[PDB]
Design a binder for this molecule. Structure first.
Ligand SMILES: NC(=O)c1ccc[n+]([C@@H]2O[C@H](COP(=O)([O-])OP(=O)(O)OC[C@H]3O[C@@H](n4cnc5c(N)ncnc54)[C@H](OP(=O)(O)O)[C@@H]3O)[C@@H](O)[C@H]2O)c1
Ligand SMILES: NC(=O)c1ccc[n+]([C@@H]2O[C@H](COP(=O)([O-])OP(=O)(O)OC[C@H]3O[C@@H](n4cnc5c(N)ncnc54)[C@H](OP(=O)(O)O)[C@@H]3O)[C@@H](O)[C@H]2O)c1
Ligand SMILES: NC(=O)c1ccc[n+]([C@@H]2O[C@H](COP(=O)([O-])OP(=O)(O)OC[C@H]3O[C@@H](n4cnc5c(N)ncnc54)[C@H](OP(=O)(O)O)[C@@H]3O)[C@@H](O)[C@H]2O)c1
Ligand SMILES: NC(=O)c1ccc[n+]([C@@H]2O[C@H](COP(=O)([O-])OP(=O)(O)OC[C@H]3O[C@@H](n4cnc5c(N)ncnc54)[C@H](OP(=O)(O)O)[C@@H]3O)[C@@H](O)[C@H]2O)c1
Ligand SMILES: CCc1cc(O)c(Oc2cccnc2F)cc1F
Ligand SMILES: CCc1cc(O)c(Oc2cccnc2F)cc1F
Ligand SMILES: CCc1cc(O)c(Oc2cccnc2F)cc1F
Ligand SMILES: CCc1cc(O)c(Oc2cccnc2F)cc1F
Ligand SMILES: N[C@@H](CCC(=O)O)C(=O)O
Ligand SMILES: N[C@@H](CCC(=O)O)C(=O)O
Ligand SMILES: N[C@@H](CCC(=O)O)C(=O)O
Ligand SMILES: N[C@@H](CCC(=O)O)C(=O)O
Lengths: 254, 254, 254, 254
């Protein structure tokens, strides 16, 4: 039960976004939700998707996590509009498409740093600004993939950006733990989303889960959202620096 | 919300048992609970502890997990008495004082195999018997410690037993996943219980957690119970073969 | 260069044994070698295989690692025959055939404990006895598989015994470190040997390595042997409690 | 024996550099060595240091790894001057001093990306250029630290850069494995070097190893160099995407 909680959900682009499965679950559990987006198209999609939620007010903020001032001012505006928050769900990554197929060793410096900036560093600065709204403690969760732990074909520069994110989670957990802020990751199995369309071989990744993972099926956004509700709530009070795989068991097999 | 769910909880000895933390949480959430014990003194404690619970009926079965027949007959009786179950919490381990409190390289064969048998093999046979009561699926959770992942001073034979149990969890997850049974572990931080008396230097282990773990505090049995509630319920659909550290973040630091 | 070093190699059965790859390499580097075996037939193979090696004398001892007396008396006799040794290569495991295929949840208690006894505990008692012949320090290496780290189809009871071995390696490393004895594992990739005939689906495991592993080829016993020379020698003096995968990179991908 | 092998060693600053331990070992084993340095100081210094080696000639190239041109042109020139190479030792990392103490959550975007660029991406572009000089295969080794696997006090931005670097090794292993180029890391224990002075609390880190690591002592640059010789030679054929801890066993304990 999350009535009287407030969470900031970063990274809804459309009805297939992982962050939207999180939103549906939290919403259904009674939470107040604030949404951040980059592209105008994503705000338009949030406005339509909010008609499916039970949020009596639209709280939408444009935050491009490449910009310190947009992250700083965005959270400062959120604090002014809704007061203190209980957590942040971070569902944000980016890499140029030519870096999500072919040969990893041909990755450009600009593409490698782009992916690090948006997919990893953004959690650091978000945590720094979000903590200002969590004087009593809180919970920050980011979304990762098994390609941060193992080399997977095609995931290439984003695998190295997820390894960076997963370490970023541990270091933030150590730093913010004395402030009663927990920081954790969910390592989601493959899910058809707008960003999946850029990963080479994505359909064969999905098929392999169905054939080989312990549950012999793929997961969906709402399953990620249910684990998010656990990590964002008091149920997980003793848990920080942790990476929970929501992937039908695929992480545990070879 | 666990109304209309039934769970078997194995390994309450007294009010400090981790499994009683689990019981309290599941009870508060509306579950029907069934309890298994070894020593007659454990049954007496269970009888006194059930007064604190909302359980309208006492469902108590003696199962020494060294005996196949006791596990077989105990789960069969549980089925005839309460019907199908939704999961099992396994909170059982044992090792001799004499092997524990000597150099690891001095561990006796008998003591090594005793600790495997009770602390690891018991999950396998329990899973096999409990699956007969879970025709539509279920969840099985066992309780481990960071000593199964790293060599910790003094934990000695029980660290090898915990590594065995953590691998047992992954193999059971692979085997039983197509039956929609999930199998997971909770890696609890140190907690003062009857069995902790067995571990040398236990007080300095507690003190290290306070000084060094991200949350700068120790965890308690109810925190283990809240993560158990997540693992045993539909909130962790899609999570199997996982090991969730309820340990203030200690696993993530060095 | 291992002239003036002496190593005990445990677990040659025939010319395909992983331990015979280790023997050839160590022999080619000038080490003096002592061999232990269980079955008469293995002693006969060792007698034949020694004609290929540069050892000027056969040091052969029957040690069934299920027997404490055989391990104690065998190492005692080794020390009386060749003096102090520089390390031990352990290449011993066993499980009953029915436990290397089908459903893990059906594993018998006696089969689970049998595999633990031979494949894990044996290392502990061997280290205890071998330490008496290494008063200046030494190196002990055991042979594991990725199935001890992940659930692998069919490997079943041996995967849990290997997770146990791997923890045994870390706990021995911690215990024996102050005596200047290093203890490490090599995680070998699949290799056609007599014991491979017990693993269901073995040929499929081999084909997956050629298709998926970074080197796109399988490894052989001599490559294990070369990593064994590294771990048994001063070249690895800083390295203990480690598990080195000699598996064409397969451990690193998913 | 590395006679008739040529290795490029990147990252000698002075007599305490880890890469100078590597050079000593490879030089002694008969390898021809080429050296790269960033700033002038490291030149002058290199010129002097190399009188301690048996290199008949001084092959020194200025390469600042922030510059694509310098990496591309530097490897090109090494190929013209010396011909094909057998491997590359990468011993290069950098972060701003302020980012190696205090609160990780305060790290600037500029500081985080600088550490990623120099300490992780540099391996990718180095590997791409160096491949051109390894048409029959070779071996690339980078130097990492346990702070890339766990959150360590103070190490902060560099911990996230080393996590990135360790994933970089695996993705390069997968990519370059079919060209018979292996890529691996050495995770060195703490060692007093010029870069160590920047790391907050370094002396406390060192003391902890002596007190708690299995070998109860610290490691040195030459021990890193001996494991580098293993990784760079045919002894480690079959080993790729691996991270070998030369740290007195500290990684294996908690
Ligand atoms: N789909 C999967 O199988 C899978 C599996 C594991 C993990 N993940 C992770 O889950 C997360 C969500 O991805 P998704 O699959 O749900 O795809 P998605 O719907 O495309 O979500 C990606 C989000 O990233 C945002 N974003 C990119 N750059 C940004 C920037 N500079 N500033 C602020 N927002 C930015 C996008 O916003 P705009 O569209 O407004 O630009 C979009 O809302 C990502 O971290 C992804 O790596 C996905
Ligand atoms: N305390 C901690 O710091 C800690 C941390 C991580 C993990 N754990 C784990 O948590 C679990 C519970 O331990 P605890 O600390 O709660 O100690 P506990 O209160 O002493 O519970 C241990 C239980 O194991 C049972 N048991 C032992 N052998 C048995 C057998 N042959 N058949 C049936 N039951 C048997 C005992 O039953 P009887 O008394 O009836 O014999 C007792 O109920 C164990 O797996 C333990 O390793 C403990
Ligand atoms: N082949 C692979 O793909 C692979 C991969 C990774 C790891 N491994 C491991 O490598 C090691 C060697 O196996 P292998 O593949 O080389 O097969 P192998 O040639 O069949 O060697 C197995 C050895 O185990 C010995 N052994 C079994 N029980 C024993 C006992 N009670 N006491 C003394 N020795 C006993 C056997 O001796 P007797 O025949 O005399 O009984 C035999 O010499 C094992 O630990 C295995 O798990 C194998
Ligand atoms: N010492 C330790 O305890 C320890 C432990 C684990 C891992 N490591 C790692 O070992 C490696 C070597 O460090 P070290 O401790 O040997 O210290 P070091 O002697 O200071 O070596 C660091 C080297 O990095 C070079 N470097 C920095 N930025 C560069 C750039 N942009 N282009 C080219 N070179 C650049 C420096 O060259 P200039 O001096 O010319 O600036 C210096 O030679 C690093 O990867 C470090 O993280 C060190
Ligand atoms: C293979 C599974 C997967 C993982 C992801 O991280 C993912 O999301 C991204 C992948 C690449 C770039 N930006 C993203 F958001 C999509 C995906 F489909
Ligand atoms: C150090 C933390 C800890 C872990 C345990 O597994 C634990 O439980 C046991 C420890 C040893 C033997 N039987 C047990 F049940 C107690 C403990 F105190
Ligand atoms: C699949 C790879 C593999 C691993 C082994 O541990 C192995 O060796 C055994 C496998 C099962 C039982 N005893 C053994 F010695 C054979 C093998 F082929
Ligand atoms: C704590 C151990 C350690 C690790 C390092 O990576 C290290 O080297 C650097 C540390 C930080 C920045 N640049 C470096 F080269 C020094 C160090 F002393
Ligand atoms: N190479 C295709 C992969 C097709 C698939 O999803 O399997 C792509 O670039 O998406
Ligand atoms: N070895 C002591 C432990 C002392 C402590 O708790 O620190 C014991 O017998 O329990
Ligand atoms: N020689 C193979 C025969 C494979 C087959 O034809 O069954 C064996 O050892 O089983
Ligand atoms: N079921 C066969 C598998 C055939 C193979 O792939 O080796 C076995 O038991 O060996």
């Amino acid at each position: 039960n999350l009535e009287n909680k407030t969470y900031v959900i970063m990274g809804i682009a459309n009805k297939r976004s992982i962050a939207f499965g999180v939103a549906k679950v939290l919403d259904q559990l009674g939470a107040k939700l604030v949404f951040t987006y980059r592209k105008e198209r994503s705000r338009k999609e949030l406005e339509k998707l909010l008609e499916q939620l039970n949020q009596p007010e639209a709280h939408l903020y444009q935050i491009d996590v490449q910009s310190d001032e947009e992250v700083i001012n965005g959270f400062e505006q959120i604090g002014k509009d809704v007061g203190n928050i209980d957590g942040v769900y971070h569902s944000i990554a980016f890499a140029n498409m030519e870096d999500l197929r072919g040969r990893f060793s041909e990755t450009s410096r600009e593409g490698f740093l782009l992916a690090q900036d948006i997919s990893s560093y953004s959690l650091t600065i978000v945590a720094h600004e979000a903590k200002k709204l969590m004087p009593e403690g809180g919970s920050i969760v980011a979304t990762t993939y098994l390609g941060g732990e193992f080399a997977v074909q095609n995931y290439n520069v984003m695998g190295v950006a997820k390894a960076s994110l997963e370490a970023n989670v541990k270091y933030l957990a150590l730093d913010l733990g004395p402030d009663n802020i927990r920081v954790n990751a969910i390592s989601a199995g493959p899910i058809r989303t707008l960003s999946a369309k850029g990963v080479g071989g994505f359909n064969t990744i999905l098929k392999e889960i169905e054939e080989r993972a312990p549950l012999k099926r793929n997961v969906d956004q709402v399953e990620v959202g249910k684990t998010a509700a656990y990590l964002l709530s008091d149920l997980s009070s003793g848990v920080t620096g942790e990476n929970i795989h929501v992937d039908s068991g695929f992480h545990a097999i070879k």
